[PDB]
Amino acid sequence: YNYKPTLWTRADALKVHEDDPTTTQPVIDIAFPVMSEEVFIWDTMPLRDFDGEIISVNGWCIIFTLTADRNTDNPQFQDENGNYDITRDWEDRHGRARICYWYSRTGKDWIFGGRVMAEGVSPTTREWAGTPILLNDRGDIDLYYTCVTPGATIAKVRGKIVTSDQSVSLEGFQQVTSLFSADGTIYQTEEQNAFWNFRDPSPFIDRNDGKLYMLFEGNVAGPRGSHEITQAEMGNVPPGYEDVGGAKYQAGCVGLAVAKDLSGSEWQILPPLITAVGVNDQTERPHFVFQDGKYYLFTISHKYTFADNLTGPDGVYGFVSDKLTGPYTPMNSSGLVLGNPSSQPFQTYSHYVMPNGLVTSFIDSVPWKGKDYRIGGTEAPTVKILLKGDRSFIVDSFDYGYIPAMKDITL
């Protein structure tokens, strides 16, 4: 592999425009419904195949979610005078993240199928985001996911989906295989950075190559703050914009790995496809859409993970290329594909662009009056974007949590 990474540059970031109507999510209505009064969900991982297509099994649409319990009645989460503090609860959720699954014949109105892995199966208590892949017409599934604290390790667990006429259940998911961790030469380690990023496996079979790959979030290797900003990372900045502040501490990247064979048992770490040194620290949940012979690389990020003297909205950013290993071009010239409106900047997150143009999100925080907001923990309205060359256009909206399958497999 003789390739060079594409840099997302400060010059690119300066082009990022908030509240572009073609590139901005509709405003979440504060009277939004919730899909469960018992649990929170946020990161949503639809069941798909190695080609990236959303798959239904025996007419059942399937999604996996990062999940946690609503502590409505637990005394630990009580306000002064003994009231349930929904906010403190919601914001403490990442520590108790578990992966659950839901099912529906309609892609809507989801039924809770419960927990994927029994407690104690995951090496780490935290089960963070990844991808469920349908291996088989017998229903076998490899759940790639992230084991966090201690450390950060990409891993997989095999199981199996069994459908009935009116319900769906899971078998297996009893043994987790750790695949790899940050190496220190290419991707940044805990040793080098206590706040290092390493998570979110999205496996895929390349159509031109036939080989098994995966994207993941990472940081560029090196001790924290040792990265320097050269004119490469700067890009072709305008006069008066040479001041980068503490940009040295932002070193986000989209990592790449390749499997020895399609079983996905052993993985060789490769150089990153996208690096954002001096621009953004977090390029999370990377994922591909394959369209018009092109590689559409999407990755989500935050307003407040941008480097100094740079800004953008919370949402999904994107890059397009003719080949897997680049060179990539930022979507819509700046990289921004779908951003939250500035009036409700944190209404949604974890935008997952599917090959049918549908984009799913979970509702985080919707403003009401002054400093108070309503928290969600439920799916946002699914939007459709249209991809055209290196430009995206939002095109219409569907119902809350609408995640239809593109293809049905009979077992």
Ligand X SMILES: OC[C@H]1O[C@H](O)[C@H](O)[C@@H](O)[C@@H]1O
Out of 8, 110, 128, 346, the residue judged to bind ligand FRU by CB under 6 A: 128
Annotated catalytic residue: which of 12, 43, 142, 379?
A: 43
How many CB atoms are closer than 10 A to CB 137?
A: 10
Q: Which of the residues 360 through 399 are near ligand X (CB under 6 A)?
A: 364
In the complex, the smallest distance separating the C-beta of residue 43 from ligand FRU, rounded to whole angstroms, is 5
For residue 390, indicate whether it is catalytic. Answer: no
Assess 44 for contact with ligand FRU (CB under 6 A): no
Contact letters (x/-) for ligand FRU, 88-107, by CB under 6 A? ------x--x----------
In the complex, the smallest distance separating the C-beta of residue 106 from ligand X, rounded to whole angstroms, is 28
Assess 94 for contact with ligand X (CB under 6 A): yes
Identify the H or E element spanning 116.
Answer: none
Residue among 289, 257, 250, 254 at smallest CA distance from 274:
254
Selection from ligand FRU, ligand X, none that 361 binds (CB < 5 to 8 A by kind) is: none
Residue 234: DSSP 8-state = H
Q: d(Cα 395, Cα 401) in Å, to the nearest integer?
A: 17
Q: d(Cα 406, Cα 393) in Å, to the nearest integer?
A: 21
Residue among 178, 141, 183 at smallest CA distance from 156:
178
In the complex, the smallest distance separating the C-beta of residue 346 from ligand X, rounded to whole angstroms, is 7
Q: Which of the residues 205 through 234 are near ligand FRU (CB under 6 A)?
A: 217
Assess 407 for contact with ligand X (CB under 6 A): no
* 3-class DSSP assignment, residue 41: strand
Selection from ligand FRU, ligand X, none that 364 binds (CB < 5 to 8 A by kind) is: ligand X
Assess 349 for contact with ligand X (CB under 6 A): yes
In the complex, the smallest distance separating the C-beta of residue 240 from ligand FRU, rounded to whole angstroms, is 33
Assess 200 for contact with ligand FRU (CB under 6 A): yes
Assess 298 for contact with ligand FRU (CB under 6 A): no
For residue 85, indicate whether it is catalytic. Answer: no
Assess 407 for contact with ligand FRU (CB under 6 A): no
Q: d(Cα 235, Cα 231) in Å, to the nearest integer?
A: 6
What 3 state SS string does 379-410 have?
ECEEEEEEEECCEEEEEEEEEECCCCCCEEEC
Assess 88 for contact with ligand X (CB under 6 A): no
Q: d(Cα 330, Cα 212) in Å, to the nearest integer?
A: 25
In the complex, the smallest distance separating the C-beta of residue 254 from ligand FRU, rounded to whole angstroms, is 12
Q: d(Cα 187, Cα 338) in Å, to the nearest integer?
A: 27
**And the tokens for 72?**
């409505």
Nearer to ligand X, 113 or 401 (CB): 401
In the complex, the smallest distance separating the C-beta of residue 308 from ligand X, rounded to whole angstroms, is 20
Annotated catalytic residue: which of 89, 200, 281, 284?
A: 284
Nearer to ligand FRU, 296 or 346 (CB): 346
Identify the H or E element spanning 89.
Answer: helix 86-91
Q: d(Cα 319, Cα 387) in Å, to the nearest integer?
A: 11
**And the tokens for 294?**
């092109």
Nearer to ligand X, 66 or 257 (CB): 66
Find the angle CA(366)-CA(43)-CA(63) to the nearest 5 degrees. Answer: 120
Assess 314 for contact with ligand FRU (CB under 6 A): no
Biggest alpha carbon–alpha carbon distance for the chain: 65
Q: Which residues bind ligand FRU (CB under 6 A)?
A: 43, 66, 94, 97, 128-129, 199-200, 217, 284-285, 350
Catalytic residues: 43, 284
Chain residues that interact with ligand X, rule: CB under 6 A:
94, 349, 364
